[PDB]
Amino acid sequence: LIGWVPHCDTLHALIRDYREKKKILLNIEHRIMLRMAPDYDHLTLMQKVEVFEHAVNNTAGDDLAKLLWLKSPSSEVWFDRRTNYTRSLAVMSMVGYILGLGDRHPSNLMLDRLSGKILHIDFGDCFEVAMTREKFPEKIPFRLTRMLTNAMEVTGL
Amino acid sequence: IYPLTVASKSTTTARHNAANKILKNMCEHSNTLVQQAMMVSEELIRVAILWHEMWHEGLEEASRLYFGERNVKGMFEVLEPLHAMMERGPQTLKETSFNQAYGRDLMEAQEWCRKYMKSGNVKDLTQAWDLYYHVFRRISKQLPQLTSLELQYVSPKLLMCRDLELAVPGTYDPNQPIIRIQSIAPSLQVITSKQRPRKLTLMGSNGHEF
Amino acid sequence: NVPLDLTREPSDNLREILQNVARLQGVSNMRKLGHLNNFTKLLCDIGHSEEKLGFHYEDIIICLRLALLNEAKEVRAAGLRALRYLIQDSSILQKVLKLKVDYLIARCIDIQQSNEVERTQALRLVRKMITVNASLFPSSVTNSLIAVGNDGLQERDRMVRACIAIICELALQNPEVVALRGGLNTILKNVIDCQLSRINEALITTILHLLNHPKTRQYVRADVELERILAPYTDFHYRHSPDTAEGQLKEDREARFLASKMGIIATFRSWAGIINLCKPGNSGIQSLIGVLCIPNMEIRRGLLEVLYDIFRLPLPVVTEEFIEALLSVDPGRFQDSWRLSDGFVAAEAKTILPHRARSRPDLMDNYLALILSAFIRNGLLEGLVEVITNSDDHISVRATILLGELLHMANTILPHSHSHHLHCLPTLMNMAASFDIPKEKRLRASAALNCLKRFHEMKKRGPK
Amino acid sequence: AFLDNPTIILAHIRQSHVTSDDTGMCEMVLIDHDV
Amino acid sequence: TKHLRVLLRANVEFFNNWGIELLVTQLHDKNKTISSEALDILDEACEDKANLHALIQMKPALSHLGDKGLLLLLRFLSIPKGFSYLNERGYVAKQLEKWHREYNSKYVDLIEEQLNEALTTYRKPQRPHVYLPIHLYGQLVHHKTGCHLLEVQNIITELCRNVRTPDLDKWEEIKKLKASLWALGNIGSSNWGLNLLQEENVIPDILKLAKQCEVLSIRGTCVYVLGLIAKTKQGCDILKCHNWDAVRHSRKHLWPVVPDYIGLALPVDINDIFQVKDIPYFQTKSFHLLRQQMSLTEIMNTGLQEHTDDNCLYCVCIEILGFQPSNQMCRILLRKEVLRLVINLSSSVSTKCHETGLLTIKEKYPQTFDDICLYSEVSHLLSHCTFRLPCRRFIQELFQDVQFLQMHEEAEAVLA
Ligand SMILES: [Zn+2]
């Protein structure tokens, strides 16, 4: 029995609503990679970098940055929420790294609407279990992508 | 009260006997508290997984063991608890409904599995899986249709409480006054997902819904 | 072929039996077809004997056995026809079964190669085998008929009902073989997806017959066989067929309700079904009544139609006002048979003027008295009260009329003892004119009594 | 109803099927000659 | 003819002197349907004593009609004036013999036919009315003189012993029990019919049979016959002692009020009839291992398991007929592979994988499906196991293009 946290929505659904409103396909990045190389999953390590790097250059990742500002009634509230988001994602990055959290896909990442905080769920894969599996072994300590790093502040991370 | 109830329901005999010994000691000073907790715990787990939910997971796991792992003794041990709960009789209309649509096929398939343990012919076990797979297809076609549950249909005992001295789960501290469970909503919603979680809304003693 | 009918019986027999083998060389299929017809005509002349028709029975079966293996459906059809005229007594049937001819008879049942003439001859042989000796029916033929009936609709087989009618006949003289092969399950599953009034009545009657005699109830389980027909109403999400098209999914549910409704009515008019569905312990009638109280609109609108047909009450029209529905149930409503073209006054006076008999027992009243008492014992009245005050506007009116009809039916057909707890409605008094309960629910119960009050006036007036 | 003895059950089975079959098969396979 | 019924139900003045006589002439009408309708409305008119007395003084000829006329003629025995007229030419004695051998049991058929026509959707070649047909024993006990004949013949003893000793095994002797329950029920419909019926203590025997009976049809039959006993105040008192209440009012007033009876009675507790004793269910009373560990080609780089000399198409004829023994390691390894795929096809788990494995064998080795013994083994397996219809038709279709020369060669020699 898990309690229900109010005023929070997952990251995957938050981005999905923004793109469909702007008449933008949900999987534009994925479609570009398949268009350039249909057998993307079977490519070698060096070839997947070429396809992945090309996709992120033709699409500018700023959906999350504009999403937060459009949901802020005033600029004073907008700055306060952004500050909380920046320092709440950093705490879970180091704490999660020690715990060895994995499988941090957007469906397991929730952002508080009222306060801008970041909440993690589905603490199933811990202690570097996901890194040693034979099926797609992820080799990153925590999730820090271009979408997240472009919303904390303009100067970067 | 909550951790002990989980221990008392464990399959291990050592944990089961030890947990009950502590529980009966608590019945001296507070007997009505443990009785309500046992009733709530048994009903909540019943709502979480229904009879057709258990069979869908049990048959899928058993099929992988028999055809993938080529294990026969490991297949029977999975299906034994599933057939055991149906021999105690339904306790609600939902269980009664399941015992009518799929009652004959499951009970007959057990008979063929019983003949395999004695005769040893492979054909008896193969004929048993003809009934198991037929039910599995029927159940799999109605799982997506499940999107809402009524308390009267699944568990009549939950909506007939109207008062409890057991505190709301997950909120209890010695430095704060205790808040008890007042009532349970008559309807709960099932979230469309692979695990299909349920949304249960309680009612606190202070008028705040949890 | 030229029928000789001149030489001796052994001489006429040799040509046809020597031409059935032919080593598949030197003889055409046309000659074999003609010779087989000669054998049937010859058998009608000389009686069944091993002394006049040359060789013994066993030799004849051996050569006749080499006729169902032909690649021409015309030759196989004639071979099956010859067997029916040969099998007369149990001695011959046991000899045919000895040579394992059933392996080939069951083969011709399911080939589905545009040979409906061949398949008809095979099934006609089966009915002959059952009549001669039903206690030695082969298990190979039985398993073929079950398969063609259990899964005979998905393959668009046209001879599906012709095989179910044979399983029921076999289930009355040899239930042991049918029970082992799961033949009783096939009949139960057929009534679920059979919406023909006369056929559905016959299929359910066969199963109820096995529950009548004490020595035949051992072939039917306790609470899972007969209660299968209650699944569409008891289960809110019922899937009869694991594999079906999703185009008519909505229409499939309506078809199941219509077919299941006739099954429930059929099993409530037989003593072997009334008792089994109204057992003192856990029974199907309590589940049927219990599911009525659940606030489901689709089930409630279906169960009410079942109750009207069980008691044989005229259905009112769908509306949200009681007055319009009340006028549609009056006994003096006009009918087409009352016109001048039809019975002018004779037809009308029959349904208006009362019968001139005050002491002749009416056996139909006795049947309704027992059925009505069974539902009251299980709590039909309590269930109706919940429906009236907790359902839709057009559903409460139908339940209000049904409750009023039962009260009128029960004050003149039930005895004194059953009337002490009859006109009380303990659950209705709980939801009375009180401010404790919600105000909206308070007036619905009060308005229901006001609406039900006017029903008394209609019966007081009588037909006019 | 008193559909108890097999004498009337057999008649009911072989009459409803023949009368109420859309496909002309029960009219040809349920011939009373074969008894 | 149909318009004389409304005049009967409207209480037209003096209908019994000019309306009855017009229904007697109409009996001899040329059309059978018109005459049949006259009998239907004449039976309804006989419920009044004034109309019944009119028919007796007219003494019509109803013998030449069918069973409908016979039943209407038997109602004259309920009147002392009508009994004397009929029992003067020796008629009651003839009916007693007929109502004991020929159609005493046929009265059950009349009861069942009307109920079947009412609500069964049977139609032997809306709420209807099903009234009890006229019975000879039920009409002869209305007066003391008629009851005297029924006692000297000593028929009650014959019927009572048929109830205390029922044989619920043969369907032909069960109907004899029904033929006695309806006979005893009609006797108990009158006060003078109960005096000689309760002296042998038979009513409790029926009550016991109405709640503890193996055959559920007999249990339901006793419900109706107990209603007939409740047609009198004396009869309803007996049933009340044994916890069987009954309606104590007629039908002429459909609005009973607390202070001739209609036939209806129910137990105080309805569950006392619906109890049935439980009866136990009748069911309660190799190469496969090596094949999965290797490959079909790997092994290559008697085979029939359930093959006995009693259930084979060719082998069973060696002794009875006189056939020759069948003649033939590379082939024995294909029989096992074919059989194991057929067995695995009975589970319907992976049909495509198993169907493909059989088509390849018939392609690479088309001659392996040409032995009669293998076909018998597969045919034998199709009987014990269960297969889907599309999968069952897949088998027995690989053997369609075969010759089976061995059976043809041996059958020709012995037959010639
Ligand atoms: Zn052989």
Tab-separated table of N, CA and C and ligand atoms in Angstrom, chain E residues 307 312 315 373, ligand 1:
chain	number	residue	atom	x	y	z
E	307	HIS	N	0.559	-50.495	-29.455
E	307	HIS	CA	0.241	-51.366	-30.585
E	307	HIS	C	0.151	-52.803	-30.084
E	312	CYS	N	-5.739	-53.086	-34.059
E	312	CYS	CA	-5.043	-52.653	-35.261
E	312	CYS	C	-5.867	-53.052	-36.475
E	315	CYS	N	-3.373	-55.981	-38.078
E	315	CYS	CA	-2.879	-57.047	-37.212
E	315	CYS	C	-4.008	-57.871	-36.605
E	373	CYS	N	-0.121	-49.908	-39.921
E	373	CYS	CA	0.004	-49.958	-38.468
E	373	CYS	C	0.176	-48.566	-37.873
F	1	ZN	ZN	-0.453	-53.474	-36.679
